[PDB]
Design a binder for this molecule. Structure first.
Ligand SMILES: CN(c1ncnc2[nH]c3cc(Cl)ccc3c12)[C@H]1CCCN(CCC#N)C1
Length: 347
């Protein structure tokens, strides 16, 4: 019932520390390993414990990356420790992380299954915090490579969003190739489908655009049945990519031949009452040419998020909005002048 381990703190002084926890239960199992909920005996706080078999055959920088990160929109790593487990001669890594009760996937599904869509204030708040989280990691050159609603945790009372699951993440280095079959299919950037190994952090921006469109639509905008059919789904919205767009995606595939299909108007992709600013923003994320997509910090600055910078904005439940403007130098480093838009005069 009470488990006591000696664990290393996620950040700060390296000295190991005795940690006890109880009330453990499984909250999810899959390709990511097993994630448990538990309660810290010391403080009584709920935590998540992610348990991952250490398998040389599968690359994984999750611990390395998480020990470096400290941001209000990224799930915090509290401790880590090694243990035995199911495979009775191998070693498991255990990550003790913050517990966050909901996910964007479940909250969106709640409306979608009732033939509603997520109220617009929450689309603004969640998308904005996701772009903040992306601006933060991209400033270290770290690409998440698995942005999707299942990996976005939410506190429904405070509207705080926290990015999680860095099992696919990697520090991208110019000139060093990266694997092309990456990202969950529906959220996979087209340059990855075209087999690019020299891609950049903008593949996360495409995935974020897929999340935004999905929150506006009530279902994935690009529900491909296969790695290849994923491209067909994209084309049936954006139209057939031109030769130059393919050259921007992967120079080695420009001779690609596909039937000529014209784009579907953005204003007809979404239902009539969709806020035009959200459509506008979506059109600048879901672009074939990877360098044409907005950067996360540019996205934060988009007019779609102006309501969040209003001094009188409030959560529907009457509470104040969460922290939105406590930008750091590291966070603003891609475009420091942008602070004058991102940080409103009242903050
Ligand atoms: C719902 N949820 C969680 N629910 C409450 N708190 C949590 N903290 C976390 C810290 C981390 Cl890094 C990861 C997950 C959680 C998490 C998981 C369930 C298992 C799947 N996973 C996403 C894939 C991975 N990996 C979401």
């Amino acid at each position: 019932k009470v488990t006591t381990v000696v664990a290393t703190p996620g950040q700060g002084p390296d000295r190991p520390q005795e940690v006890s926890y109880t009330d453990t239960k499984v909250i999810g199992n899959g390709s990511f390993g097993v994630v448990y909920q538990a309660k810290l005996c010391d403080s009584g706080e709920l935590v998540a414990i992610k348990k991952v078999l250490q398998d040389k055959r599968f690359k994984n920088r999750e611990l390395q990356i998480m020990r470096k990160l400290d941001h209000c929109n990224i799930v915090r790593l509290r401790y880590f420790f090694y243990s035995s487990g199911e495979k009775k001669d191998e070693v498991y890594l255990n990550l003790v992380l913050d517990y966050v009760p909901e996910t964007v996937y479940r909250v969106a599904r709640h409306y979608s299954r009732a033939k509603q869509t997520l109220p617009v204030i929450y689309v603004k708040l969640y998308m904005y915090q996701l772009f903040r989280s992306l601006a933060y990691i991209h400033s270290f050159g770290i690409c998440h490579r698995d942005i999707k609603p299942q990996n976005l945790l939410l506190d429904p009372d405070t509207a705080v969003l926290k990015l999680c699951d860095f099992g696919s993440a990697k520090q991208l280095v110019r000139g060093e190739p990266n694997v092309s079959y990456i990202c969950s299919r529906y959220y996979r950037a087209p340059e990855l489908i075209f087999g690019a190994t020299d891609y950049t952090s903008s593949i996360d921006v495409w995935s974020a655009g897929c999340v935004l469109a999905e929150l506006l639509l009530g279902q994935p905008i690009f529900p491909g049945d296969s790695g290849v059919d994923q491209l067909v789904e994209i084309i049936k919205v954006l139209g057939t990519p031109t030769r130059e767009q393919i050259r921007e995606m992967n120079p080695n595939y420009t001779e690609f031949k596909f039937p000529q299909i014209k784009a579907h108007p953005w204003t007809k992709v979404f239902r009539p009452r969709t806020p035009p600013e959200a459509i506008a923003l979506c059109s600048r994320l879901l672009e074939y040419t990877p360098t044409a997509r907005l950067t996360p910090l540019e996205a934060c600055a988009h007019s779609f998020f102006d309501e969040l910078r209003d001094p009188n904005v409030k959560l529907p439940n009457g509470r104040d909005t969460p922290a939105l403007f406590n930008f750091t130098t590291q966070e603003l480093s891609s475009n420091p002048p942008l602070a004058t838009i991102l940080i409103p005069p009242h903050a």
